[PDB]
Each structure stands twice: as structure tokens, then as C-alpha cells.
């Protein structure tokens, strides 16, 4: 089994409610019977991999790969983490996610940009921030390995705190291609095994419709990996 | 052998001359006859450990642990690195430094904050920026292992580009303590083996005198490690 990304990212605010869902990770199969079992590392990490504190706040669903807040992060929580960050401003905190050192394919790092404020007002959010993470993701899919779900598009803290904003997604430029994003689906999956001899790189278009409708589009890149090698491929 | 820090940091600018010296790393001994031999990883890394490019610019002196620019980083160099950073703004780039996955005690990560400008005018620099890195370092020294040099204070790009600014350093609060920073020395060393049963943590004061004299002081923390365990200790 391997993650379809080496790194994930979202934002965390002061005083987000226990019960906020954060994002999903995804593991694809190396053999047909493989089933992921997700678990978190024990600690939260800050600047230059500083070990900050035991993670008392974030949990993952072992079967489905959903990360969520088990306990709210209040002002004091963020202070405990800040003071352990070796003098650097606390800008980012991350966790490790194992699927059965933290390195792809067996471990993903989930990064959260900390914002010292409340989650913003719903009405303040522009379509780009409602639709996709701040930097669009790219994906890793091994040739000649079984197809499966490798992404989910909806921003979970936005769907949770702003449930009155409707958001929908589709792909462009995937016709004839192995990718499925079905009507009303927030998931993206492959349809058949990939093969680097046919295509090494895909670049689809992800399209988000918010609401009066407004649309935002971003590239959707997928690199086809070797069945076996662990080394990251360059991305351009 | 082990590094006396897990992470190092400095700044890099556009168009710094080939031949700029950057900083030293230091490896202390686990047994009396051990001698480090330093080598760099093959690549430069950017945000969330993105593998950016082969490192064509920075070299290290294998015996002494001096990192320096073998080739200037011009506007185009920084563009090659930026475009490989997976859509994230290029703020930090790092290298791995092996002494015989990159994890203490055998591997240190050296981080450079990239500033898209020329190195600043010498006359613009305040004493704090002339004296110490932006976030002060802290050190790791194993109990019951041989003493040795574990830090060097002078900021090498500043000494190189601003040689008309005199800078000197000493410690306070080390009397009776195992630390030596000698008159006119820019190095700090231990004098005898440490022992966690006597002291687990030291917090000295590093004092820099610039030039008319102005002085800046910063804490100088040292954590005493187990002779054997690799796990980072929390720092407060």
C-alpha cells in the first residue's frame, strides 16, 4: 500500500470546535487484497522538525483516513506548542500518518498552517479559498497496481462551519483517461491500472462551482510512479 | 560521532558571489579516536521536503565542516528551484549533511531562508543581525562522551561581505562549568565529559560585541543527551 500524496496540508485556527473534520488521507494498493489501517505518530512537530508535544488534539479514523479534532485547540494549547518550538515563530505544525522516519510511500506528513485568529466569517471567504487548498495538490499513482480512490475535494472545515455555502466539483480533460470524478461525487478515483509506457504524467483540470454561481479552476497533476521505487519524482 | 545540532540555518540572497562562506557544522565523538568526514546529500529540498534539484551550488569541506558557495546563485538559479517547489512560494531550501532519511545524530539538515534581493548594505545591519542567527541555536552534547568543539559564533556571510565591522564573542555564567570560549576565540568547546546525573540542561549567555561598541546578548542552551538514545529531547 502507498499514500497517493507524500504531504497534505490544511489550516487550524484558535478555538475550532472539538469535532471539526480536517481532511482525508488516501492509500492505494500494491496488491488486490491490501487494506489500509491508518494511525498517527505520537507527537506534533513544528519548525525544522522540532518535536513539540504529544498530540492531544487530532485523531484519525483508522479505516477511512479521516483526520478530525478530538479536542479544541484553544489559546493555551497553541501557547504550549509555541513555547516548545525552539524560539521560532509557530507557523506550521505537522503530524505523521502511517498506513500499516516519515517518508513516502508508507508514511505521509500532514501539515497545518496555524492562524492566530478565529476561523474567518463565512461571508468573507472568496471562491478560491472555499474550493481548494491554498496550494493545489498533486498525486502519486504506481503503474501496474490496482485502481482506487485517491483524493477527496471538499474542504472539510469549510463544509462544517459554512454549511450554507454549496460547493461542487468535476474534472475537465479526462475523456479516454483513467480518472473518474462522478456526478455529485467529491472523490476522484482511477478506473484501471496505469502504465508509464503509455503516460508518465497526467495534468487534468479540477473545477469547483460555488453557490449566483462562481467557478474556480486549478490544475490537477498526477505522476505515474514505478511499481517499486520509493524515490520522489521531480515535479514541474 | 553525532552532530551537536540536528538543524542549522542561515540566509541566502540573489547573486551572492561564488566563494561566500556560509557556516560550519560540528560533530562530537562517541569514542576517542572518531574523526568526522562530512558530505552533503545530492539534492536541495524546498517546502514540505519537496526534492527540488541536484545541488549545483553549495559544497562542504569534508574535514572541517565548512559549507560555502562553490557557484553563485543568480536569478535563474532561484527560478529553477522555485519552479520545482510544487506551487509553494520558495521561502526555505535545505540540504542534508552526513558525518560518516536525515535524522540526528548521524545527519543534520542545514536550512537557508531565501531572500529575493541582494545581500543588504553593511551599514543597514543592526547589531542583533550582525551577531547571531535570527533564531538563536541550542546544542546537543551526550553525557560520558569525549569533550570537543561544538559551535562557532561568527556569521560567515557577514564577516565576508562586511569585513570592516569587527565582531567578538564571549560567554557569561559558565564559571565552574564545562564550557570554554577563549579570549579572541570564535569557537565554543566542552572541557570534560558531561554527566546527566550532575546537570541535564545548561543555559549560558552568549555575548556579542560589535565595533562605538554595542553589545547583544542571547541565551546559549545545551541539553545533555543519553550516551545512546537518538530521540530528540523537548526544549522549553
Swiss-Prot record, chains A, B:
Q: What is the effect of changing residue 162 to Y?
A: In HSCR1; sporadic form
What mutagenesis or variant effect is reported for residue 8 to S? Defects in maturation and processing
Region feature Cadherin-like region 1 (CLD1), mapped onto this chain: 1-118
Task: Please give the annotated consequence of changing residue 13 to A.
Answer: Defects in maturation and processing
Q: What is the effect of changing residue 196 to H?
A: In HSCR1; familial form
Q: Which residues bind Ca(2+) 1?
A: 143-144, 195, 197
Q: Which residues are glycosylated?
A: 70, 116, 164
- Protein residues bound to Ca(2+) 4: 229
Binding annotation for Ca(2+) 3 = 228, 230
Cysteine disulfide partners in this protein: 102-107, 122-162, 131-208
Residue positions annotated to bind Ca(2+) 2 are: 197, 226-227, 229
Where in the numbering of this chain does the Cadherin domain appear?
Answer: 133-232
Spell out the protein name for this chain: Extracellular cell-membrane anchored RET cadherin 120 kDa fragment
Query: Which organism's genome codes for this protein?
Result: Homo sapiens (Human)
Tell me the name of the encoding gene: RET
Of the intact sequence, the residues represented are 29 to 270 of 1114
Amino acid at each position: 500500500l502507498y499514500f497517493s500524496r507524500d504531504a497534505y496540508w490544511e489550516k487550524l485556527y484558535v478555538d475550532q470546535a472539538a469535532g471539526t473534520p480536517l481532511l482525508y488521507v488516501h492509500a492505494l494498493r500494491d496488491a488486490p487484497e491490501e487494506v489500509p489501517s491508518f494511525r498517527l505518530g505520537q507527537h506534533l512537530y513544528g519548525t525544522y522538525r522540532t518535536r513539540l508535544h504529544e498530540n492531544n488534539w487530532i485523531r484519525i479514523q483508522e479505516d477511512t483516513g479521516l483526520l478530525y479534532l478530538q479536542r479544541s485547540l484553544d489559546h493555551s494549547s497553541w501557547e504550549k506548542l509555541s513555547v516548545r518550538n525552539r524560539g521560532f515563530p509557530l507557523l506550521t505544525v505537522y503530524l505523521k500518518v502511517f498506513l500499516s522516519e516519515c517518508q513516502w510511500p508508507g508514511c505521509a506528513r500532514v501539515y497545518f498552517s496555524f492562524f492566530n485568529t478565529s476561523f474567518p466569517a463565512c461571508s468573507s471567504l472568496k471562491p478560491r479559498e472555499l474550493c481548494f487548498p491554498e496550494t493545489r495538490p498533486s498525486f502519486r499513482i504506481r503503474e501496474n497496481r490496482p485502481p482506487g480512490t485517491f483524493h477527496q475535494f471538499r474542504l472539510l472545515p469549510v463544509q462544517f462551519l459554512c454549511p450554507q455555502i454549496s460547493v461542487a466539483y468535476r474534472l475537465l480533460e479526462g475523456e479516454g483517461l483513467p480518472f473518474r470524478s462522478a456526478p455529485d461525487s467529491l472523490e476522484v478515483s482511477t478506473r484501471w491500472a496505469l502504465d508509464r509506457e503509455q503516460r508518465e504524467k497526467y495534468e487534468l483540470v479540477a473545477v469547483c462551482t460555488v453557490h449566483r454561481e462562481e467557478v474556480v479552476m486549478v490544475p490537477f497533476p498526477v505522476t505515474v510512479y514505478d511499481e517499486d521505487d520509493s524515490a520522489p519524482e521531480f515535479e514541474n
